Every structure is written in C-alpha cells, then in structure tokens.
C-alpha cells in the first residue's frame, strides 16, 4: 500500500563489496536526503553505497541485462 | 552492518488504522527527514503515521 516507509542511506561504505557476496541491488527513493544504491548480500543484508562512486556504477553495469 | 539503510516515512496514512490490524510498531530512525511511527499489520503491511497524531500516541500507550 502507499504509506509504507522507504529505505534511506545515511552512511555509505567506502569499501568495494566483494562481488561474490552480491545478490542484487536497488536505488533508494529520491525522497531520501541522500542518493543511494543498496546492495543486497548473500546473508540477506543490505549495504548502502554512493551511486557516484565509479565501482558502484561498474557493478550495476555488469549486473544489468539489456 | 554499519552501512545498513533505515526505513523512513514520507507519505503518512490518510486514515486512522483499525486497531485490530496492528501487530507491532517501531519509531523510525531519528535521522529520517520526518518523524514517523510505523505500524506493522497482520498482513505484513507497514503503515507510516505521524507521531504528533493523538490516536497514534493512544495506540502506542495501549500496546
């Protein structure tokens, strides 16, 4: 329904996430105070990253299909 | 971990949630841009509410 909360990022990791841990990603709601790409990991955890970091962009490109 | 996202509220409910639906609640991270109380319903819906609403505080009190 339309009143659910949205996940927002407040602190980003500075460290590239080992690609073997990565299950998926999503972009955080633009209403959040900061931009965010959240990576979902094998153990079901969520890790905030900065979309403007080159490695985050590189990861997303290798994860996406055309 | 230290880099987990937090749930934040942007669109508050437009109705008083029937009490019977509610299983639990949590207050959102105070770092969110708006104050929020999220009620968790039986059916796994999370519903954002304004902690300044009397009915919300009344619910929390009773729970």
Curated annotation (Swiss-Prot), chain A:
Cystine connections: 8-32, 9-48
Superkingdom, natural source: Eukaryota
Name this protein carries in UniProt: HCC-1(9-74)
Organism: Homo sapiens (Human)
Organism lineage: Eukaryota, Metazoa, Chordata, Craniata, Vertebrata
Encoding gene, per UniProt annotation: CCL14
